[PDB]
C-alpha cells in the first residue's frame, strides 16, 4: 500500500534579485535576460540543506498521483528498493524497484502516462523498474499565481521499465521547490513579442483590416471633440445649481453631483466602455445620496472595471492582489455573501496587511471595513484623515519628481494638502465657503514662531507663473492683489481689531457672493446649452481606402490622410465675465497714492529723476532752478486727470470695456470666436504597433506611429464686438487722455497675439493609440496569457540595455 520515505519537510522559500550597471535600482525584470544564470542559481539552491526533503516530497506526490491513485483499488503498492544519490557535487541519481500485488481474483490493466498496457493475472507481483543516472537537472520556468519563474528540474534521459525516455518531464504544472524571485517574471517584456507578435500571418494583421482601422481613426478624432463638449457641459451644469444656491444652507460637492449624474455616466462611459455604472454607484456612496447604496453592492457589480483600473495603475506589487480577486470572488451571488466571505478570510487578510509599514499606516481602515456591514466610502474617508494624508503626500512627491516642467502646479497642489480641512471635500459643508478658505485665505501651516507670511495659494501660483515677466506692475500686484483681503483674508487678524462683527469686517460673505456671482455668470450665461449648441464637427473626405503593406515583422499604411473641420459659428462670450473678475479686484476708492507709487514712486524712475535733478538737459545746463519748476505740473496733470471717486476697477474697465462700468450690459458680447478650423492628420508608410496597459493582461490594443499631425486655424475670425471706444467719463479723461491710448494699445496687442497665440499653422507628431472594443466588452486584440509565450510585462527593464545576475558585478 504505502512506500518508504523519511524527509517530508516540503516547506521552502524564494530568492532575491541582483541589480547591475546603470539601470534604475527598481528591479522588475522578466524571462530571457538571464540566459545561463538560471542553471547556476538552481544549482546553488540544490546546494542547500533544504533540497533533499523537497525533492523527496516531489517523488512522493509523483508516485502518489501518477502511480497508485489510478490504482490501489486492485493493486497494493510495495517499495522494497528505493535510493537517491543527491551528492554535494550537485549530481543525483536514483534507483527504484516497486511491486504491485493484486489481492483480487481478476485480471486488470496498469495505467501510466504513456502507452502502457500490461496484463497481470490474479495473485501476481508485477515489477516496476526505474533508473536514472547522476546528471545536471534541466531548469524550466513555469508560471506562478503572481506570474513568476517556476523553475523546475527536468531529466534528460531515464530508463523506465528498461526503456529510455528523453527530456523527461517531472510533475508538470505542479512542483514543490517553492524557490522564486520578487523581481524576475514570466513572459516577453514589451519588445521580445514584437518579432513574432506581428508579421506575415500573425495575430494583429489577421485581426486588423482596412475598414476597421479607418473607422478607428475617425472614432478617435471624433470622440475627443465629443468628450470635450461633454466635460464642458458637465462642469457648469453642476455650477448651474451651485450658483443659484441661497446663502445659509451648505451644499456638499456631491449633492448636485447626483443631480446631473446621467451626464457623468455618459462622459465616463464614452471614455471607457461600460465604465459608467462603476462611477454611477461610486458617486452615491455617502449618507447624502438620495438612493444610498452599500460599497459592497458597489464593488460586487462590475468586477471587470475594477480589474481594468487596477491594472491601469503603475504600482507593480498590486499584481499580487490581482491573483486572489477571482479566488476571492468565485461563486458569489450577492454582496451579503461577499461580506461573509471577506469576514471568513479576514484571518488571512490581517497579517499580510498589518506586516508592511506602508500598510501599517493603513491598518485601522481595513478593520472597520471588515467589521461594520454599512461602510460608505466617503464617510470612511472622512473618518480617518491622517493615513490618507500620509499616503497622498508620498504619491504627490513621486509625481512631483516625475514631471518637473509644471514645477509650480506640482508645487501648489502640495501646499493645499498640508491643512487637514481639504479632505473635508468628502464631508458635508458649504462647498463654495470651503473652497474659498482652501484658496482665498492666507495660510500659516507651521509652528516655529508664526508663518502667516506664507499667504494664500493662488497668489503663490501667480508669483510662480509670472516670476519675472513683469517688473513695474508687480508693485500693483502688491498694492491691489498681494494685499487684497478679498484675495488674501489674513486669518486670525479679522477678529483682532473689529470685535463687533461689522458688515465690512465679514469679508467672507462678500468674497463668497462674488464667487457665486462669477460662477453663475459663467454657467447659465456663458456655458449655457444654447451656446454649446453653436459648435459642430463636419467630415470632409471619409472616402479613400488605406491599404496595409507588410514585409516580415512590419505593418505599414500606404497613405494616411484624414481631415475634419470644426465650425465655431458664433462662439459668443457675453459681457459681465471680466466684469466679475473686476469685482474680484478691490473696490476701494483709493487710487491716487497707488498711481503715484506705480508711475512715480519707483526704483529706476527715481534714478532718472535724480540724474536729471543733479545734471542733464544738454544745452541748457544752468537752468536748474526751474527743473523743480517742470517736474511738478506734469505730475499735477497726471494726478488731476484721475477722479478721486473712481477706482482701479474703473481704470481697468476703461482699457477693457471702453464705455463706463455704469453703462455696461452683460447681454452683449466681448470676445467673438467664429469660423471653422481643420485638422489634417496624414502620412505615408506608418507602422502599426501593439499598445498596452500598465500591468499584466490578456487584452491589448494598438497604435499608429508618428502621425504627421497638422492643425491650422487659417480662415477664422477672432474679434472684439466693441472695437471702438465709447467712454464718456474715462478715468484719465481730459487733454491728457491716456485711457483711449490704453484701449488702442490693448487692441493692437490682442491683434498681434492672436496672430501668434491664435492661428499660427501648428505642426506636431505623436502616436495615435486606440484600443478597439466590441459591443459586448470583447475587444479584438488579446492573448490567452496561459501559455508561457503570450505574457507581456510593461514594466520589465529593457534587457538590451544591460543586466547581470550579481551584486554590481
Amino acid at each position: 500500500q504505502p512506500a518508504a520515505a523519511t524527509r517530508i519537510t516540503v516547506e521552502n522559500g524564494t530568492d532575491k534579485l541582483v541589480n547591475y550597471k546603470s539601470s534604475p535600482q527598481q528591479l522588475f525584470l522578466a524571462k530571457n535576460a538571464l540566459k545561463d544564470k538560471l542553471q547556476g542559481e538552481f544549482d546553488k539552491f540544490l546546494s542547500d540543506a533544504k533540497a533533499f526533503p523537497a525533492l523527496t516530497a516531489d517523488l512522493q506526490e509523483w508516485v502518489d498521483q501518477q502511480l497508485f491513485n489510478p490504482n490501489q483499488s486492485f493493486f497494493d503498492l510495495s517499495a522494497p528498493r528505493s535510493n537517491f544519490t543527491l551528492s554535494s557535487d550537485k549530481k543525483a541519481s536514483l534507483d527504484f524497484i516497486f511491486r504491485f500485488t493484486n489481492f483480487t481474483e481478476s485480471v486488470q490493466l496498469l495505467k501510466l502516462p504513456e502507452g502502457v498496457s500490461v496484463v497481470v493475472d490474479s495473485k501476481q507481483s508485477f515489477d516496476y523498474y526505474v533508473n536514472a543516472s547522476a546528471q545536471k537537472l534541466l531548469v524550466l520556468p513555469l508560471s506562478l499565481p503572481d506570474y513568476t519563474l517556476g523553475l523546475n528540474y527536468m531529466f534528460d534521459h531515464i530508463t523506465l521499465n528498461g526503456k529510455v525516455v528523453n527530456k523527461f518531464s517531472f510533475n508538470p504544472f505542479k512542483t514543490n521547490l517553492n524557490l522564486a524571485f520578487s523581481n524576475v517574471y514570466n513572459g516577453v517584456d514589451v519588445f521580445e513579442a514584437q518579432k513574432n507578435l506581428v508579421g506575415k500571418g500573425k495575430y494583429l494583421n489577421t485581426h486588423v483590416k482596412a475598414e476597421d482601422v479607418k473607422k478607428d481613426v475617425n472614432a478617435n478624432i471624433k470622440n475627443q471633440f465629443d468628450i470635450a463638449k461633454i466635460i464642458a457641459e458637465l462642469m457648469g451644469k453642476a455650477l448651474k445649481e451651485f450658483g443659484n444656491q441661497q446663502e445659509g444652507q451648505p451644499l456638499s460637492f456631491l449633492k448636485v453631483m447626483d443631480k446631473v449624474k446621467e451626464d457623468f455616466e455618459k462622459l465616463f462611459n464614452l471614455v471607457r466602455p461600460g465604465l459608467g455604472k462603476f462611477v454611477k454607484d461610486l458617486i452615491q456612496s455617502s449618507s447624502q445620496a438620495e438612493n444610498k447604496i452599500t460599497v459592497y453592492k458597489l464593488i460586487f457589480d462590475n468586477k471587470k472595471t475594477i480589474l481594468n483600473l487596477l491594472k491601469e495603475l503603475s504600482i507593480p506589487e498590486l499584481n499580487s492582489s490581482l491573483g486572489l480577486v477571482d479566488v476571492l470572488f468565485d461563486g458569489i451571488t450577492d454582496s451579503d455573501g461577499l461580506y461573509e466571505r471577506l469576514q471568513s478570510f479576514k484571518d488571512l487578510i490581517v497579517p499580510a496587511v498589518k506586516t508592511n509599514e506602508k500598510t501599517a499606516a493603513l491598518s485601522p481602515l481595513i478593520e472597520e471595513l471588515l467589521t461594520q456591514k454599512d461602510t460608505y466610502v466617503f464617510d470612511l474617508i472622512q473618518k480617518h484623515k491622517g493615513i490618507l494624508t500620509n499616503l497622498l503626500k508620498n504619491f504627490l512627491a513621486d509625481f512631483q519628481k516625475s514631471t518637473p516642467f509644471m514645477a509650480d502646479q506640482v508645487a501648489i497642489f502640495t501646499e493645499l494638502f498640508d491643512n487637514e480641512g481639504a479632505f473635508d471635500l468628502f464631508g458635508e459643508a458649504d462647498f463654495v465657503d470651503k473652497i474659498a478658505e482652501l484658496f482665498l485665505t492666507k495660510r500659516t501651516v507651521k509652528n516655529g514662531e508664526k508663518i502667516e507670511t506664507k499667504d494664500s495659494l493662488l497668489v503663490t501660483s501667480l508669483k510662480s507663473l509670472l516670476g519675472e515677466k513683469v517688473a513695474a506692475l508687480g508693485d500693483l500686484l502688491d498694492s491691489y492683489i498681494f494685499k487684497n483681503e478679498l484675495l488674501n483674508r489674513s486669518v486670525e487678524v479679522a477678529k483682532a481689531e473689529a470685535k463687533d462683527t461689522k458688515g465690512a469686517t465679514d469679508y467672507k460673505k462678500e468674497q463668497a457672493k462674488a464667487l457665486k456671482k462669477l460662477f453663475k455668470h459663467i454657467g447659465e450665461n456663458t456655458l449655457s446649452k444654447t451656446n454649446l449648441d453653436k459648435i459642430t464637427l463636419k467630415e470632409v473626405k471619409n472616402t479613400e481606402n488605406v491599404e496595409l503593406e507588410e514585409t516580415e515583422t512590419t505593418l505599414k499604411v500606404k497613405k494616411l490622410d484624414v481631415e475634419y473641420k470644426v465650425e465655431l459659428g458664433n462662439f459668443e462670450i457675453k459681457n459681465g465675465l471680466i466684469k466679475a473678475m473686476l469685482e474680484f479686484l478691490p473696490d476701494t476708492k483709493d487710487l491716487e497714492t497707488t498711481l503715484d507709487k506705480l508711475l512715480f514712486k519707483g526704483e529706476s524712475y527715481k534714478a532718472m529723476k535724480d540724474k536729471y535733478i543733479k545734471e542733464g538737459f544738454p544745452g541748457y545746463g544752468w537752468a536748474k532752478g526751474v527743473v523743480p519748476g517742470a517736474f511738478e505740473s506734469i505730475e499735477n496733470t497726471f494726478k488731476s486727470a484721475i477722479d478721486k471717486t473712481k477706482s482701479i476697477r474703473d481704470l481697468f474697465g476703461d482699457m477693457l470695456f471702453g464705455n463706463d462700468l455704469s453703462s455696461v450690459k452683460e447681454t452683449d458680447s466681448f470676445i467673438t470666436l467664429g469660423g471653422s478650423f481643420d485638422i489634417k492628420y496624414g502620412g505615408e508608410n506608418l507602422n502599426v504597433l501593439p499598445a498596452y496597459y500598465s500591468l499584466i493582461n490578456s487584452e491589448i490594443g494598438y497604435q499608429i506611429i508618428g502621425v504627421d499631425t497638422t492643425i491650422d486655424a487659417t480662415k477664422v475670425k477672432v474679434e472684439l464686438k466693441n472695437k471702438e471706444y465709447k467712454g464718456k467719463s474715462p478715468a484719465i479723461n481730459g487733454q491728457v487722455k491716456l485711457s483711449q491710448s490704453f484701449f488702442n494699445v490693448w487692441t493692437n496687442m490682442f491683434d498681434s497675439i492672436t496672430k501668434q497665440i491664435f492661428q499660427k499653422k501648428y505642426e506636431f507628431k505623436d502616436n495615435i493609440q486606440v484600443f478597439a472594443r466590441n459591443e459586448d466588452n470583447t475587444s479584438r486584440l488579446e492573448l490567452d496569457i496561459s501559455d508561457p509565450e503570450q505574457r507581456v510585462i510593461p514594466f520589465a527593464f529593457v534587457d538590451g540595455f544591460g543586466i547581470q545576475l550579481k551584486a554590481v558585478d
Partner: antibody
Amino acid sequence: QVQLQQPGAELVKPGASVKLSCKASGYSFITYWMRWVRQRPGQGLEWIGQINPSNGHTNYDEKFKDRATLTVDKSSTTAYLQLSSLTSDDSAVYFCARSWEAMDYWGQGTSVTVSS
Amino acid sequence: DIVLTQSPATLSVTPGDSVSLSCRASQGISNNLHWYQQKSHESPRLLIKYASQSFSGIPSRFSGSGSGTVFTLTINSVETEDFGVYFCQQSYSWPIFTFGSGTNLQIKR
C-alpha cells in the same frame, strides 16, 4: 452593550480538571475574537489564547500551549478554559475578553483556588 | 519582541492638573498603540485607541498624541476617580500585545 461572563470564585481540587466559562451576548458572536487572559493578584497580565468565530483556529502562548485548552460553544455563544489542576500556585484570577478592534470589552473575572 | 517603556513609574498630582504620561518603544509601530486604565482590583478600561483615536463614553478631558515611538497621554483635568494604574499597549503584531511596566496615578493633597 456586550455582556460576556458567567462564573465567579472557582474552587478545584489538585489532580482534577477545571472548566472556566464565559457566556457572551448582545452582538454577533461570528465577527470578533474571544480571548483568555491571566493575572496574578497584584502583578501583570498574561495571555492564554484565541479561538473563534467558526474557523475553529486557535492561537495560544508557547508558555501556555501545553497548559490550557480553549473550546467554543457556538449556539450558546460561550468560551471555555480547560487547564486542569496541573499546577498549584496558579490559584489566581482569570479574564475572558472580546475583540479590542471594536473595543476591548471584558468579563468580571474568575478567581480559582487549587485546594481541597 | 517589542518592549514598551513608561515614565515615570509613579504620578502624584493635585485635582484638575494637566498631566501627561510618556510611553516609548524600541522601534516604530506607526499608530499601533493603545492606552488602558486599570483601577485597583478590577478589569482594565481601554482609554485611547491607535494613539490618535479616543473612544465613546470616555470623558473628553483625556487626549493623546503619537509619533514614531514617543507616544503621550494627556489628562487636561485630574479628578478623583481617574486615579489608578495605566498601561500602554502595542498592536503592531500579536505575539502578545506587550503591556508596559505600569504607571500608578496618585494624589498629593
